[PDB]
Write a protein that binds this ligand. Sequence first.
Ligand SMILES: *[C@@H]1O[C@H](CO)[C@@H](O[C@@H]2O[C@H](CO)[C@@H](O[C@@H]3O[C@H](CO[C@H]4O[C@H](CO[C@H]5O[C@H](CO)[C@@H](O)[C@H](O)[C@@H]5O)[C@@H](O)[C@H](O)[C@@H]4O)[C@@H](O)[C@H](O[C@H]4O[C@H](CO)[C@@H](O)[C@H](O)[C@@H]4O[C@H]4O[C@H](CO)[C@@H](O)[C@H](O)[C@@H]4O[C@H]4O[C@H](CO)[C@@H](O)[C@H](O)[C@@H]4O)[C@@H]3O)[C@H](O)[C@H]2NC(C)=O)[C@H](O)[C@H]1NC(C)=O
Lengths: 146, 58, 69, 361
Amino acid sequence: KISTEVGITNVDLSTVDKPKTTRVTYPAKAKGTFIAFALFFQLVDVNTGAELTPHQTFVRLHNQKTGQEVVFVAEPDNKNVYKFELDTSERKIEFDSASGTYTLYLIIGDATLKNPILWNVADVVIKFPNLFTPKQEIQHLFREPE
Amino acid sequence: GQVYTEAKRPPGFDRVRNAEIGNKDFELDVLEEAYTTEHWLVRIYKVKDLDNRGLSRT
Amino acid sequence: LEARLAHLGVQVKGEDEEENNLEVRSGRFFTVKLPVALDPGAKISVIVETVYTHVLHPYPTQITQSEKQ
Amino acid sequence: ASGPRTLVLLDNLNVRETHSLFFRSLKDRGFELTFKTADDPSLSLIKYGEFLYDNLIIFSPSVEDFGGNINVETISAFIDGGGSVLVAASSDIGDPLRELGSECGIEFDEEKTAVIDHHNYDISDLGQHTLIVADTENLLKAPTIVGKSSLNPILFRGVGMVADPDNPLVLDILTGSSTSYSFFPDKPITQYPHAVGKNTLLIAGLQARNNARVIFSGSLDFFSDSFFNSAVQKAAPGSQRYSQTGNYELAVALSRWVFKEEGVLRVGPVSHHRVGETAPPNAYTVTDLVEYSIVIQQLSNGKWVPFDGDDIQLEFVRIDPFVRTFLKKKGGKYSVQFKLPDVYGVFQFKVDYNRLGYTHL
Ligand SMILES: *[C@@H]1O[C@H](CO)[C@@H](O[C@@H]2O[C@H](CO)[C@@H](O[C@@H]3O[C@H](CO[C@H]4O[C@H](CO[C@H]5O[C@H](CO)[C@@H](O)[C@H](O)[C@@H]5O)[C@@H](O)[C@H](O)[C@@H]4O)[C@@H](O)[C@H](O[C@H]4O[C@H](CO)[C@@H](O)[C@H](O)[C@@H]4O[C@H]4O[C@H](CO)[C@@H](O)[C@H](O)[C@@H]4O[C@H]4O[C@H](CO)[C@@H](O)[C@H](O)[C@@H]4O)[C@@H]3O)[C@H](O)[C@H]2NC(C)=O)[C@H](O)[C@H]1NC(C)=O
């Protein structure tokens, strides 16, 4: 039960080609705009070469205009490198409404680490395609005498 | 599909159409029974109210 | 049970009936005139009979189709 | 309102001592409290078709046999008879509690799953980062359900839940921070977690169609005497350290709301007539001015004072509203005058006042 920094090797943002790639360090809000998209991860402990799977490896998409937030889990690959991919044609239920700009937050939490990161990497562009409040007033339209 | 309408027929027989019933046993989701005359000639049900706890059914 | 009384009739052992006048002197006491006056030390079998109505209430108000009220 | 007599279940009788402050406050309002062991045989909510205890409180996680007459079906009948039920759960939910939650539309998580946070867990957790510090930012933002004062961060140590998107009634009195996922403490995640995002309510509450408030509270630990009197400071470096948790005010407010004390609206006599008359005439003629007046009361500490009633909407409807106007307050009555619509037939005055944190009308 010894806690060490989570660390990051290379946040590689690679736009999907319906394939140019860009790379950014951990404290660097990626410059540019990406329109769809799969990004590359590389988590590694510090003070000792050790990639350590953290209990929480999410990817949050935030819609600033509408306020909706969708969270995507990340799966480790055979190369010990997480990969997040957005089809732009699948997940119609997941993404009902298309928003021009989406915040792409990164969340990495673990029981035995001491550096919970929430820094957003860059912006994403996706182009896949109540009762309690008082209701609007209705006024009858009277007929006209001849 | 339980009443024996005829002397020698399958239980749940229909005299008018001379055929056995298909959906032998089922439970009405919304229509609780209210009255059924002695000869089953006129059946009166009663639409249930909206569910209290707001469940999908009833 | 004063506001629930049905017919209330008095009797005397044997074939006889008595008149019970209704008066107020409070639970609307009934005055009964004995057929024969009785001196001290006498005994008179008065078979008072009354009937109360609407005094039985079902404690389970809403029984299902198959229950005992 | 409802009867003072309340029956409270306990996993062990030693809970009353640990839960002393809240129970005392709950007894300030004249409530009669009867504590029964969760497994007591002589546990009878209903007897001879008449409910004994008007309100029910449950503080017993780790239960699977409620007792003689207490069943999920019986509790459902209770809530259908106007009872108010309060529940709790701390990592030991049990199948009966999950069934009762499912009936009302709240999907309790797995037995061993506790809501977790890494960005916001206070220094007092001493172990897995599960001592969620729910901030006041994310809240219901209502005046009746969560009070009207200002609160400090509320400590929560329990199992999260997720509201069903079919229920319109279910209202989320709280929501977990964007980082709370509510999964197994120590196990890898290979599938989508339960309420991974802002959907982990943790204080979800119901409001039945017949006005039977129910408040499925996330954690029993939330009502603990230690939580009421403890200090809060998020483990994030350099966060503020409030001296008082601010949990007591929220607990008292939710207790008052669930027992028909803080918000209740009763509809008084209604009256409608031609302008210039005194009695409701049969069969109003077409294009005839009509005046409607309805009194409404608010139950402020039992006074039954007149409701403020800013926005109450009258609807003149046949199958769909022909007219929809705003009642005007005048001498305690909500009165409006409007010409009847040209179309003839049967119609319905239908004053409907459904607002968040209030009674239905
Ligand atoms: C025999 O039996 C039959 C069975 O009942 C009877 O048929 C019924 O007749 C009624 C009325 O005649 C019909 O209702 C009307 O439907 C019209 C078309 O349907 C709309 O459907 C969509 C809406 O669907 C739902 O929407 C919400 C969602 O929750 C829901 O609340 C709502 O109830 C509805 O179910 C919509 O998107 C479509 O575009 C269609 O429009 C519809 O236009 C009518 O709406 C009118 O009228 C109602 C009440 O009459 C008002 O509440 C509406 O707001 C709207 O009001 C407008 O007209 C009024 C005069 O009639 C004005 O006073 C209002 O100001 C408003 O006027 C605006 O619009 C005008 C132009 O339209 C402008 O000139 C104005 O300036 C304003 O801008 C109404 O809902 C039933 O649908 C129909 N039944 C069936 C099965 O079809 C039949 O009447 C019987 N026979 C006889 C002789 O009576």
